[PDB]
Design a protein around this ligand. Structure first.
Ligand SMILES: *[C@@H]1O[C@H](CO)[C@@H](O)[C@H](O)[C@H]1NC(C)=O
Ligand SMILES: *[C@@H]1O[C@H](CO)[C@@H](O)[C@H](O)[C@H]1NC(C)=O
Ligand SMILES: *[C@@H]1O[C@H](CO)[C@@H](O)[C@H](O)[C@H]1NC(C)=O
Ligand SMILES: *[C@@H]1O[C@H](CO)[C@@H](O)[C@H](O)[C@H]1NC(C)=O
Ligand SMILES: [Ca+2]
Ligand SMILES: [Ca+2]
Ligand SMILES: [Ca+2]
Ligand SMILES: [Ca+2]
Ligand SMILES: [Ca+2]
Ligand SMILES: [Ca+2]
Ligand SMILES: [Ca+2]
Ligand SMILES: [Ca+2]
Ligand SMILES: [Ca+2]
Ligand SMILES: [Ca+2]
Ligand SMILES: [Ca+2]
Ligand SMILES: [Ca+2]
Ligand SMILES: [Ca+2]
Ligand SMILES: [Ca+2]
Ligand SMILES: [Ca+2]
Ligand SMILES: [Ca+2]
Lengths: 71, 276, 276, 276, 276
C-alpha cells in the first residue's frame, strides 16, 4: 500500500474508477544464518518469487506517527 | 506579398506565352546531385566531378552551379537529410529489402513537413489528422507505442512495462509512424540516439526529384493504402554501370528540371520546418 | 419485389445528394480482416485483437462488428476461401516466388464466379468463352490436359494413355486453368485430393479487397495477357512491422471501405438472379 | 436491377405466347441427381452413369449437363448438403423410423434460408418470428435449451447446471429447432461436433425437387402444426428396383423440371445463405 | 491562398486601429532566451527557470511557452546557432577582445541569409554583389584566398601553392568573408574541420533580438565601412548581477517583443517564396 504527498492523496476519503498498471518484479531470498551455541551454523539461502500485478484497491496505513489513506 | 496572399489573381486566356525561361533558370540556379558512395567507388576516378560539371556546362549550367554530395547509403542519408540548392536530384539505389526505407526517405524529401518537438517522457501524444505523422530519425530509432484509454492507462500494454508495448520500429535511421487518430499513445523511444517529432504533411516538394536506380515501382510516399501515387518527380531507370546513369542524368537534365519547380527551396537545407 | 426481371431505373441529373451513410454502414455492417499467421507470431501479443477492436471502435465500428480470421499462408488460404463478412480485407504477404499463386488467389476472391460441377471421368470439357475457366481446389491439385480434335482423338496425346497428357498443374492448392476455347479436352485430375469446377467470371466481387504487404505490383486477376488491371480494391503497402500494417489498416479503414461496395450478389435484389 | 427491383412491371393479357423453351433450357442447364449409396449398390454397374447420360441425351440434354452425386444416407447427406447444378433432383429413400429427418432435409433443401452464427457460449438467443428457427448440423449435434424469464432466470431449469436443461435433439446430423418466440433461451450444444445457426426461412427454392422413393406422404416442410403443404417439387413414387426408379426419372424429367424453376441456384452451393 | 505571386495591397486611412494583439500573441507564441553558462553559474539556483517562467506568466506568457536555451560562450554559440522559437532574445555578454566575432554572430542571427553550397576543391568562386558573402562555420575555420585575374592566374599568389595564399580567418568558429566583387578567388579551407557557404543577405530577421550585456556599442552587422546601423533589435544594458538582467528582460518583455516582428519568412504566406 502506497501513499504520497501529492495532491492525489491530500483528502482521499472517497475514490471511484480506480485503475492501475504495474510491471512485475522479482524478490530473491537472501542468506540468513542461525547462531547455534555449538558446531556448524546452518544458513537459509535462496528463494525467489516473481511478483505480478493484480487488482488495486484502497487501504489505510496505520503507523505510530501518521494514519494515511493509501492505494 | 504576404498581405496580398489572400487576394485574387486574374488572367486572360489569350495572353501571349513568354519566351523559354530554361536558359535564365539554369544561369541563376544551383543543382545538387546526391549519389551513393558505391557510385563513386564504381566510377573509380578523382576528376569525374569536373567532367560532369563540364558536361552540364555543355548543357547550359554555368560552372559552379552544379554540386555533388555523397551519401553512404539510404539508411545513413535518411538521418536528417539536407537539401542544399535550388534543384535537388537524389539518385537512390534500389534494394528489394529496403522498400519501406526508400518509401520513407522519398516521403520525407518529396513533401513539405511541419514538425514540432515530442517530449515522450512528459506528454502522451495524438495524431489529429491524416496528414499528421511521427517522423523519427537519428543513429537508431526504436519506437514502442502503447495506446491509452480515457483513464490514460494502457490498452493491451502496461503503461509502465515497456516490454508489453507495441513495436513499430527497431534500430531505424528514419521512420514515419502512423497510429490510429484520436487515441493518446505513450511513446518509449531511444531518445539518447534519435529524435522524434510530431509532423504535418503540408504538400508536395517541387525542388526534390528522386531517381530510383534499378528495380520496379515500389515507392509509396502516402500512408493511405488506397493511394500509391507516382508523381513526375519520382523517376526510375535501369542500370548496369554508374557512368551510364550519370550520362543519362546529364543528357536529360532539362526533362528532370521540367518535372521540378522553382521557389520550393528554403533558406535552410533541412527536410522539415521546425516549430518549438 | 420484382425479382426475376431487369427493369430500367430513371433518375434526374439534379435531384440531390443524400447525407453521408458511412456511419450507418459501419454501425450495421461487419468487417473481416484476413492476415497470415506470421503476423500474429511477430505481434506476439495475446490481446492484440481486443486492442484492434478498440481502435476500430474509435473509428466508429461497434464492438463485435470486426472479426479477425487467421490463415497459415497464401497456399493454404487458397483452398476454398470463404469470405462471409459484409466487408472483407485480406492482408496478403508478397512472396516473389508465389506470384502466380497470389494472382490466382486474388482472381478467385476479387471476382465473382459461377461454378458448375466437372466429372472428368464421364465427360470431355470445353471452355465456351473468354470468361470460362477451370478452377480446382484441394490439398494437392495436379491437372493434366489432352486436347482432342473434331474426331475426338487427342492432339499430342492419347486418351487411353494418361502419361502423354500435358501437365498444367502440379501439387497446387488452387489453380485456375485456361485452355483454348472451343476444343474438347480430356482431363486427368487427382480427384481424391482435389475438386475441379467449370467456372464463369461474372464480374467483380465488390465487398472483397486485397492489401498486398510487400513487393511491387505483380497481381494479374485477368487471364488476358494484354491487360493487367489494378482495381481500387487491390491495395499495396510497404512494411517492416505488422503492428504498423494493422495501424495503417485501422487509421484508413474509411478509405478501404470506400474502395469497396456491398456485394451485389448478397442483397435482396439479387433474389432469383443467382443468390439472395 | 437492384435500382429497379421496386418498380412495377406491366403486362398486356393479349401478348402472344412464346414457343416452348424446354429445348433451349435443357441445352443451357445442368441437371444433378442425388441418390443413395444403396441405389448404386443394387444397380451394381460401373457404366450406369454413362448410360443414364446417354438416355438423358435422348431426352434433350447435351452430353455434359447431367451429373450424379452419390450420398451415403439421409442423415449423412443432411450435414451441409451442397446443391451444384441448375436443377437438383434428390432421390430420398423412405424409412418409417426417420420421418422427422426426412422432413428436416426436405425443409433445408426445398427452402431458402438466411443464417447467422450463434455463439451459444456467450449470449442467449430468441426466435423473433415464425420464420426464425435454429438449424444445427454436424457429425453429432446434441442441443439443450433452458428458457429464461424477464429476470434472466431459467424456467424449469438452472442457468448454471446444464444437467437440468431440456433435451430437444440428441446426436443429430441435422436438426431444426423451433422454440417459443420472445423467450430468451440459454443453449448448450456439442460445438466441437456441430455448428448451430440462427436461420430465417425466406421462401421456396424452386430448383430442388425431392422424390421420395417408397412410403407414404410424411414430409412436413413447415413447423406450423396445422399445415403440411405438399408442393409440386416434393414427389413420391413406389419401387421394387432402382433401375425402374432411374428410368422413371429419365422418362419424366420433362415433368420433373416443369415443376421446378431456374434462376434460383445460388452462387455458392450451400443449402443456406450465411452472414457473419 | 495565392502563393508565390506578389499581389499589391490597397488599404486606406480611417480604417480604425484594431485592438491590442499583444495578449493574443503572448498566448499563442513561444519565447526563447539564449544566455551564457556563466549566467546560470552566477545565479546558482536550480529552480530559477521555473521562477522566470512564473514571472513571464505574470507578464502574460502561458506556462511552458518560454524556453531557456544555454550556450557555453559566443564562439560555441557561433557554430550554426538554431533559433526556432517564435521570438528569440539572445543575452550576449560583451568582450572587448571578441568584437568582430560578436558582430559576426549578430550578423548571422539578425539577418536572413540564403546560402548555397561551396565546393572549393572543384570550382573557383566570386562574390557577385554587395549582398554576397562567404559564411564559414564549424569547429575551426582557416580560409586562405588567392585572387585570380582574367587569365585565371593568381594575383600575388600561385594557384598550386597554398602557402602563398592570403589568410582571412584563423581558428574561427564563425567567419563572414567579404572579398572584392567580380574577382574569382581560389579558396583553401579546412573543409574537414568546418563548412563554407555562399550566402546572400536577403534582409533583416525580425524574430531575433540581441541584448548586449555590459560594454559599449561595437556591433557592426553590415560589411559597409560607411554604415554601422544600430537597429531596434540591438539592445545594450549595463549589468552587475545576472538576476537583475533577467528581471529587466522579463519586466520589459513587452518592449523587447515590440522591437521584434514575426519572422516574415517563417509563416504560411511565404509558401513558395522560401518556406511555409
Ligand atoms: C523573345 O523571343 C523573341 C523571338 O525570338 C525575340 O524577338 C524577343 O526579343 C525575345 N524577348 C522578349 C522579351 O520578347
Ligand atoms: C442531413 O443532414 C442535414 C445537415 O445537417 C440535416 O439537416 C438533416 O436532418 C439530415 N438528414 C436528412 C434526412 O436530410
Ligand atoms: C415459333 O414456332 C412457330 C411455329 O412453328 C415458328 O413458325 C416460329 O418460327 C418459331 N419461332 C418464333 C420466334 O416465333
Ligand atoms: C476592443 O476593445 C474595446 C475597448 O477596449 C472593447 O469594447 C471591444 O469589445 C474590443 N473588441 C472589438 C472587436 O472591438
Ligand atoms: Ca526506416
Ligand atoms: Ca502488448
Ligand atoms: Ca494517424
Ligand atoms: Ca499508400
Ligand atoms: Ca504428349
Ligand atoms: Ca496455384
Ligand atoms: Ca479459354
Ligand atoms: Ca492479364
Ligand atoms: Ca434429424
Ligand atoms: Ca429441467
Ligand atoms: Ca419459434
Ligand atoms: Ca407442419
Ligand atoms: Ca569570428
Ligand atoms: Ca601571397
Ligand atoms: Ca564582396
Ligand atoms: Ca559596417
Amino acid at each position: 500500500d502506497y501513499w504520497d504527498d501529492s495532491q492525489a492523496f491530500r483528502n482521499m476519503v472517497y475514490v471511484r474508477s480506480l485503475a492501475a498498471n504495474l510491471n512485475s518484479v522479482i524478490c530473491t531470498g537472501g542468506d540468513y544464518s542461525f547462531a547455534l551455541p555449538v558446531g556448524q551454523w546452518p544458513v537459509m539461502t535462496g528463494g525467489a518469487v516473481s511478483l505480478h500485478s493484480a487488482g488495486v484497491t484502497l487501504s489505510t496505513q496505520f503507523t505510530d506517527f501518521v494514519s494515511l489513506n493509501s492505494l | 506579398q504576404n498581405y496580398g496572399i489572400n487576394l485574387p489573381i486574374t488572367g486572360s486566356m489569350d495572353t501571349a506565352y513568354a519566351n523559354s525561361t530554361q536558359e535564365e533558370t539554369f544561369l541563376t540556379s544551383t543543382l545538387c546531385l546526391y549519389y551513393p558512395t558505391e557510385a563513386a567507388t564504381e566510377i573509380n576516378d578523382n576528376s569525374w566531378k569536373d567532367t560532369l560539371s563540364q558536361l552540364f556546362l555543355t548543357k547550359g549550367w554555368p560552372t559552379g552551379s552544379v554540386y555533388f554530395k555523397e551519401y553512404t547509403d539510404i539508411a545513413s542519408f535518411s538521418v536528417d537529410p539536407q537539401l542544399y540548392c535550388d534543384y535537388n536530384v537524389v539518385l537512390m539505389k534500389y534494394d528489394a529489402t529496403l522498400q519501406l526505407d526508400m518509401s520513407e526517405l522519398a516521403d520525407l524529401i518529396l513533401n513539405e513537413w511541419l514538425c514540432n518537438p515530442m517530449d515522450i517522457t512528459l506528454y502522451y501524444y495524438q495524431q489529429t489528422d491524416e496528414a499528421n505523422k511521427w517522423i523519427s530519425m537519428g543513429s537508431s530509432c526504436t519506437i514502442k507505442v502503447c495506446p491509452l484509454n480515457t483513464q490514460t492507462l494502457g490498452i493491451g500494454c502496461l503503461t509502465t512495462d515497456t516490454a508489453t508495448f507495441e513495436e513499430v520500429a527497431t534500430a531505424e535511421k528514419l521512420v514515419i509512424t502512423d497510429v490510429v487518430d484520436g487515441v493518446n499513445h505513450k511513446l518509449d523511444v531511444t531518445t539518447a540516439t534519435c529524435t522524434i517529432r510530431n509532423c504535418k504533411k503540408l504538400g508536395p516538394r517541387e525542388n526534390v526529384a528522386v531517381i530510383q536506380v534499378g528495380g520496379s515501382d515500389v515507392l509509396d510516399i502516402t500512408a493511405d493504402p488506397t493511394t500509391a501515387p507516382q508523381t513526375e518527380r519520382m523517376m526510375r531507370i535501369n542500370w548496369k554501370k554508374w557512368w551510364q546513369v550519370f550520362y543519362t542524368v546529364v543528357d536529360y537534365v532539362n526533362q528532370i528540371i521540367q518535372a521540378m519547380s522553382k521557389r520550393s527551396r528554403s533558406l535552410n537545407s533541412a527536410a522539415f520546418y521546425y516549430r518549438i
